[PDB]
Design a protein around this ligand. Structure first.
Ligand SMILES: Nc1ncnc2c1ncn2[C@@H]1O[C@H](COP(=O)(O)OP(=O)(O)OP(=O)(O)O)[C@@H](O)[C@H]1O
Ligand SMILES: Nc1ncnc2c1ncn2[C@@H]1O[C@H](COP(=O)(O)OP(=O)(O)OP(=O)(O)O)[C@@H](O)[C@H]1O
Ligand SMILES: Cc1cn([C@H]2C[C@H](O)[C@@H](COP(=O)(O)OP(=O)(O)OP(=O)(O)O)O2)c(=O)[nH]c1=O
Ligand SMILES: [Mg+2]
Ligand SMILES: [Mg+2]
Ligand SMILES: [Mn+2]
Ligand SMILES: [Mn+2]
Ligand SMILES: [Mn+2]
Ligand SMILES: [Mn+2]
Lengths: 289, 683, 683, 289
């Protein structure tokens, strides 16, 4: 009911890194404090590292196990955006703002970081556990994918959106907004594929899959809180970032056809400014009563 | 979370295996002892309140100036003497969120339920203190409920229009199309839902002054109307809602339907304009016989005969259209078109289905015009004459564009008070007042039709609530017997009040002399058939009330012949969506969708049980989706035989059933005399 | 492939390293020997032809009845005595595919070039056989060309209006918006391009009846207008073309501009609605000094001052608006807005740029109104007064809506015949006749302004063709000297003819007494500056023609003071899209885009060299993209100093130049006195 | 030395079939004989099948096994083109020219056609035989992919090109030329990757790999001959198409670094005939003249 519509929306959102000139960001970058520059670098590396997993494994593995030519095509398109567009865009932002040696060090740090690694490996673990012709394991991986696309990225997206909403780092903020817009539709689409599997299950199996999804969300959420304090306490933003994580967790759940887990909260206004029934022929004698 | 929210959510927490319905009552108390009483604005006396509301442009001073302050004080005291209490949290919440008057910044509550009822009653009475007290007693007892426009806007300075629905006839011309767009924007600005008959517009590929294949058809006008309704969206508060109606014999009927297909392209898809299809008996006959049908080009028919295709009877002119070489037509499969209708209704709930012959075989004003389309809720079925909007500096020929005022009887409260007659007459008087004080300066045909037809719509709510609270299954024959008797009583007293108003004013509605009311034909089935209850339980339900017999109907027929009728149309059963919450009533005469409905407001969730739901009447509150749609059709036809206009009949379907089941339900509705079908809501 | 098409494609085949331009001539012969003569309907005599065309509803009886048949035959004989031959295949192809009258089945040719010219001349003369013969000699010498509407439709019963440029003022009301939509639909039905001023409309987030954040802004009105123009598309022949103009100080200016971005959503982007931006001198001053600017909410300004934001001089009103707390405004960066304009023009060529103060510092009718916006082609610049379209059964206040009359002089043919005066006066008479015979019954302000202002637009074309065939580079100072002298003579004889018509008829245009013509200010620069050629080559070009001196201009000023002026506006240089082909001329006063243009008709390719192109003048026929845009701006300003209205000025950019270069060209145009900038065509 | 330039070339060649309006072919299609229309539909259906498998399976699987994020980005982009652009374009052509029943019938015909099934079996079999960290199985699949890109498509491409060259079906032909332009660069790129693996081998191993490549080519060739006769005999063109496929077989071998195998022949000359702006800020000196 939905793949051709998503095909259309995906291909009409096509874009390339070269379209946004990045050099003019240096005019606001130079005015940020060390803690602001440090947080930005670390957040950016976090997003880059997670998105690489999605391009190399997450999207291609789902495309491999999903049946249907049109679904495979949409999924291929999404994988292309991760590897050919998003990855180059993150690299471009880095090369503009930091010298080569600084980039290498930030990636070394974020690569060793406990909270980034915990979530990255949790997601990758579920992708590696998909078994041929087993729709339960596929569903679990789709849940992981939706959580990455619609939830885990947002502790990171917060900061570029925060600057973007203030008139700072506008070129890289525009790029991030385009990336985020792609991840949103990726999350919604994979969510619909997961609901299709979920709806084929018994009531007991459904309850079991719901427990899986909520348990996974809880593990990721508790690590996100730690990740958040680790990065954002030094710039005083953690309270507001936490509200943004919960709001996006609720969107991820709704993508999977589940109820929101967290109470509704208002979001930081600066970040906001940045942001078929079965056809059966008439058989006659249906006109007589 | 608020305390009342927790108390309302405590309903679903079962105790000893049973729902805690009584907790709901506690919630209302909390909702009043923690929010409403604190957020209300209290004055030293009623004088200061009225002065503050008048000078601050909250109230119109004209309607209040017709009473001395002593009379207004007496009316307010009568309203507050009942000590009305909302039995459910959602009733009070809906009133104080949608209908209670708030300040300019919407931080405080200026109007209580009694204050709103008193203001509406004072507006209704038009200077009569005793009549104002009668209206106060009628509304505080919740026997009668004015429509959402009337209840919300009566006596308010910042009000819109009190008329809910407007029906426009669009003539086949660019001037008429532009005027229809303008009038649609004007009426959506006034807050009313606008319905437009596009059957007179010539189809796609017709000639505009001898250049052929030039017209965009009804789809271009549909896109224009959709953009007009999007632009005029009640100042951004409520999305602009429009309806387009097309005859099924129009050539564009497929393209029309293609506007609602989920795969439609953006240049064809229309999303804010509801669609309705008018099906004459000829189409159903052709589909039944499996004979290939013909859709027609309206402009060729107009050129050949001088009249529009929807202006004459297709049952007698279809063969002449087909055999006429000067009439252009396209071959279609009527059964395939019916299946397309069923598929579209399954996918999106559209189109509305209007069985034209079912409407016009009992229509009392066929002399003025046949009913060619319905309103946005598919319950208004009145005669309309198309207007000839000419060029600038040329006089326009103003026709009749349908518009009626809505008001619903609460069946449970009306029958509990044993006051069918008094409630019906007072509601008719209130609707007559609403029609009289309605003057729309940008819709000329609507204004002329309001002044001439004097049409009103008196609906009913809480049919299923009354039946379930009295131990009667909605699908049972006893329920249909009750509906027959109750709505025959409503029709009798509405006709009596209309004739009494005509006598007291010395005037009838325009062209009443040619109506079936004047000739006495309308009363035929009422002077030969007895509509008293056939079951002892229903007769006991009607005890203490004089059920009209054939002799009373004969006397009423003689009275109408002597004095006439003030209203061309009196009864129409609207959906009554949100005002049914305030009255603690089930929506319209439809069966309940669910026993307890979970609605999300803000970041909180609330549960509204059906009014009177309990352990002893749990299974009498059968959900509509679990019901046989054929028996619901039987109920709606039984009610419809006593309603001069239509009934907003929503079909409640299960996901398992096919489009063939939907087509069977539609054909049974057509067979049983159902005039219109509103929605196909699938569970 | 037809023989003439092969002969035309043989041009590109190079013989001795040179294009076979002469082969094009042979193609024309083939196009007439093989196709045109075979498919041309011939009659035994002209009487039979005229009877057949009148009886079969091809022609109008009224204009032919003003002459005896002998006079009509004499006019046709005068047309055919020239023995006119199309010099290029594309000229004849464009005439016989776009303008020649064809049968209802579109397979036979009823009108030759001489027949169409004779019919247009007879329509122009309005009963004067000698005047008709003068018009025939004017058009068969190809000195003057009536616009595509006039040339195509004059004397034809099945026709649109002879005017196709319409400017509408939209007042800030729903009634006025609906009336603007209706008038746009009616004028697009007539075949005209409609431009609407949206600056008076209040921005998004403004109050409607004192409810906040209610207005949808000008973008919703643009969506409505875009739907109206899509619907009204000349009976499905051409795509409905409309333009919307917004002042740059309107707050919606960004959202306005956002309607043309590729990334814009479907509910934001308008596809068939051109956009133009009006830029007062205050915006340019703010951008120049890098001071942050303010975009104002029009309704707050109207409430505070009682006048619309675009109705007062922003140069003296901007500081008062900024310092007024009751005027709501938003901070913007004017340089960022200029860069956005340049980027949007690079992407799509939109918006059109109107330099308000450049228009209004030489506007002769500022007393009537200041020029607030331009037309769809951005060359009509006239005073307009908004209309107050009230509710129904209420009298409207009809203002002035611009609709000027187009017609172009062929500079090459006019100057080689040494007939600037005669051609200008005859073209003015024909434009006056067409303006007087125009009666639009669905556009009240357009009709009122046509009756009152009597404004016509007399344009020129083949400027680059004439300069290249005379060994003059378009960017050379000699070309600007020639343009100065030629257009000063055109202005002189246009003013003289307007004053002569005013003296003959005894009437001037409405509110002429307040114009600068009446006060003599308009002639100031003409009574002090001599516009005789400063180069000997240009003077030799003007040999045989009297060049008006300062004494002649003083005499003309005295004549205008004594007798008045019949036309409020006389000269406007339109793009002249397809009529330039038939006249074998370069389009407008613009430089040529390509020396030889390749076109695809059906499945066949065709080649049109620029008129008079050869090996000797190949270098002088420089392409527009290769030219320096500053010198093109200089030439257009030189012409504009003698044109009362604007000039359709398209920028021709290379893909290499950036938005800084586009902004520099725009700012140099503003500095040099350019009134309008039409398009940014990137190669 | 080459991936970056292929990346840039691939992304700059990006297109969608919707860019080309197809209603212009309606008349030249109507005018073809029933035999010609039948061959044309079947030819494009055979192409659709090849692109379906190249997009779903071939390109993603090669992407999985090739090392380097940039190489993977190119291969992912090529995969997207196969199924999201190329395979879909054929449906755009079908939906314009043919009624639904004829479309349904031709897709049923691909399922039961023995030559089309054999070629899919052979190519996809090799893709699915790739073993992780086994460069020889990867080489074999890359040879198969080059043979699909640069040889197997051409029995299909012949006919749209043959019409394009006569000025017939030129809109459909424009789509096909864009597809062909893509496959040419895809065949070169995969060829270069195959040569990398081949060049690592001993002389003895190389000799075996040449045997594999030539044996596979001959086996595919013999099947393609039968397929060509089956499709083209009814339009009288089988011998001409055979010359064309031999020509392209040599190009495939060359893409693999091997000598041409078939002798040169004259190809039908008809078929041979068938073949944002930069932004600068405004300076204060740009406002004065
Ligand atoms: N369900 C309800 N519906 C309407 N108003 C209510 C409701 N519950 C409380 N109120 C309002 O809040 C007030 C709180 O009083 P409450 O009902 O608790 O009893 P009380 O103080 O003994 O007086 P009384 O019942 O006589 O008004 C009421 O007087 C009434 O104005
Ligand atoms: N270049 C052209 N432009 C316009 N009409 C042309 C042209 N060439 C030929 N014709 C048309 O074809 C006719 C034949 O012209 P042709 O060159 O054969 O000699 P002619 O002496 O002009 O002929 P005729 O006896 O028709 O006047 C012309 O009279 C004219 O109607
Ligand atoms: C002008 C116009 C009309 N129409 C259609 C819609 C109207 O219902 C229909 C009638 O237009 P009319 O306004 O009646 O046009 P007309 O009166 O000049 O032509 P006629 O004498 O034949 O009536 O034409 C279009 O579809 N597109 C258009 O642009
Ligand atoms: Mg008409
Ligand atoms: Mg107003
Ligand atoms: Mn990504
Ligand atoms: Mn993603
Ligand atoms: Mn491919
Ligand atoms: Mn490929």
């Amino acid at each position: 009911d939905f793949t051709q519509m998503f095909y259309n929306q995906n291909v009409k959102q096509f874009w390339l890194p070269e379209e946004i000139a990045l050099n003019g960001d240096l005019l606001t970058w130079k005015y940020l404090g060390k803690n602001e520059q440090d947080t930005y670098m670390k957040v950016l590396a976090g997003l880059t590292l997670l998105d690489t997993e999605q391009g190399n494994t997450g999207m291609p593995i789902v495309a491999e196990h999903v049946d249907g030519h049109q679904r495979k095509a949409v999924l291929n398109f999404m994988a292309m955006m991760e590897n050919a567009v998003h990855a180059k865009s993150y690299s471009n932002i880095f090369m503009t703002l930091a010298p080569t040696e600084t980039i290498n060090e930030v990636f070394e740090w974020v690569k060793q970081n406990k909270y980034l690694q915990k979530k990255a490996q949790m997601i990758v673990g579920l992708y590696k556990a998909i078994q041929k012709d087993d729709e339960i394991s596929l569903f679990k991986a789709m849940v992981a994918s939706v959580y990455l696309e619609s939830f885990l990225f947002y502790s990171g997206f917060y900061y570029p959106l925060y600057f973007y909403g203030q008139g700072k780092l506008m070129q890289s903020g525009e790029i991030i907004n385009l990336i985020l817009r792609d991840e949103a539709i990726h999350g919604v689409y994979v969510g619909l594929l997961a609901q299709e599997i979920y709806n084929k299950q018994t009531e007991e199996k459904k309850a079991e899959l719901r427990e899986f999804a909520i348990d996974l969300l809880n593990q990721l959420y508790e690590n996100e809180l730690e990740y958040t304090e680790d990065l954002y306490d030094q710039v005083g933003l953690s309270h507001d970032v936490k509200k943004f994580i919960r709001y996006n967790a609720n969107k991820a759940l709704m993508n999977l056809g589940f109820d929101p887990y967290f109470e509704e909260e208002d979001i930081n206004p600066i970040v906001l400014n940045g942001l078929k029934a079965t056809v059966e022929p008439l058989k006659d004698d249906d006109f007589y009563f | 979370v608020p305390k009342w929210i927790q108390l309302n959510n405590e309903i679903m927490i079962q105790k000893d295996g049973k729902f805690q319905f009584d907790k709901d009552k506690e919630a209302v108390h909390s909702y009043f002892v923690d929010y409403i009483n604190q957020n209300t604005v209290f004055f030293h006396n009623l004088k200061e309140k009225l002065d503050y509301l008048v000078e601050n442009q909250y109230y119109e001073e004209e309607f209040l100036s017709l009473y001395s302050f002593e009379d207004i004080k007496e009316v307010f005291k009568t309203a507050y003497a009942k000590k009305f209490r909302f039995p459910s949290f959602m009733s009070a919440f809906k009133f104080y969120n949608d209908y209670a008057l708030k300040t300019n910044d919407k931080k405080k509550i200026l109007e209580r339920y009694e204050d709103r009822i008193s203001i509406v009653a004072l507006f209704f009475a038009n200077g009569d203190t005793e009549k104002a007290k009668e209206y106060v007693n009628l509304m505080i007892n919740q026997e009668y409920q004015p429509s959402t426009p009337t209840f919300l806007n009566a006596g308010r300075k910042r009000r819109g229009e009190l008329v809910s629905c407007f029906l426009l006839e669009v003539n086949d011309s660019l001037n008429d199309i532009s005027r229809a767009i303008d009038i649609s924007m004007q009426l959506s600005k006034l807050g009313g839902g606008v319905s437009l008959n596009l059957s007179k517009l010539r189809a796609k590929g017709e000639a505009i002054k001898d250049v052929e294949n030039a017209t965009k058809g009804v789809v271009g006008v549909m896109k224009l109307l959709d953009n007009a309704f999007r632009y005029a969206d009640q100042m951004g508060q409520r999305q602009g809602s429009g309806a387009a109606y097309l005859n099924i014999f129009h050539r564009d009927i497929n393209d029309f339907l293609d506007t609602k297909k989920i795969s439609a392209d953006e240049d064809v898809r229309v999303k804010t304009l509801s669609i309705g299809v008018v099906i004459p008996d000829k189409f159903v006959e052709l589909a039944r016989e499996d004979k290939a049908a013909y859709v027609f080009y309206p402009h060729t028919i107009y050129k050949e005969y001088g009249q529009h295709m929807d202006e004459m009877d297709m049952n007698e002119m279809y063969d002449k259209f087909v055999d006429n070489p000067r009439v252009k037509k396209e071959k279609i499969n009527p059964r395939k078109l019916l299946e397309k209708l069923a598929m579209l209704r399954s996918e999106s709930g559209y189109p509305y289905i209007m069985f034209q012959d079912n409407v016009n075989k009992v229509h009392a004003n066929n002399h003025i015009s046949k009913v060619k389309f319905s309103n946005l809720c598919s319950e208004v079925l009145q005669a309309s004459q198309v207007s000839s909007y000419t060029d600038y500096d040329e006089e326009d020929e103003i026709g009749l564009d349908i518009s009626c005022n809505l008001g619903s009887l609460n069946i449970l409260n009306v029958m509990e008070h044993k006051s069918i007659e008094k409630t019906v007459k007072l509601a008719t008087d209130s609707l007559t007042h609403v029609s009289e004080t309605t003057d729309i300066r940008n819709a000329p045909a609507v204004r002329r039709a309001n002044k001439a037809m004097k049409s009103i719509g008196l609906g009913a709510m809480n049919l299923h609530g009354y039946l379930a609270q009295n131990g009667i299954a909605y699908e049972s024959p006893e329920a249909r017997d009750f509906a027959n008797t109750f709505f025959m009583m409503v029709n009798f007293y509405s006709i009596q009040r209309s004739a009494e108003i005509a006598k007291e004013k010395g005037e009838t509605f325009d062209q009443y002399e040619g109506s079936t009311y004047a000739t006495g034909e309308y009363f035929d089935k009422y002077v030969s058939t007895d509509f008293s209850p056939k079951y002892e339980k229903i007769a006991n339900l009607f005890e203490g009330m004089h059920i009209p017999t054939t002799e009373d109907w004969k006397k009423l027929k003689a009275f109408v012949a002597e004095h006439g009728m003030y209203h061309s149309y009196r009864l129409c059963i609207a959906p009554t969506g949100s005002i049914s919450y305030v009255q603690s009533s089930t929506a319209s005469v439809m069966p309940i969708m669910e026993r307890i409905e979970e609605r999300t407001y803000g970041n909180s969730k609330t549960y509204y049980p059906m009014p009177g739901l309990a352990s002893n009447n749990w299974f009498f509150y059968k959900e509509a989706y679990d019901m046989d749609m054929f028996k619901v059709v039987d109920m709606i036809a039984t009610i419809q035989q006593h309603i001069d206009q239509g009934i907003s009949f929503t079909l409640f379907l299960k996901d398992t059933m096919t489009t063939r089941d939907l087509n069977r339900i539609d054909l049974y509705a057509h067979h049983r005399g159902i005039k219109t079908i509103y929605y196909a809501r699938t569970k």
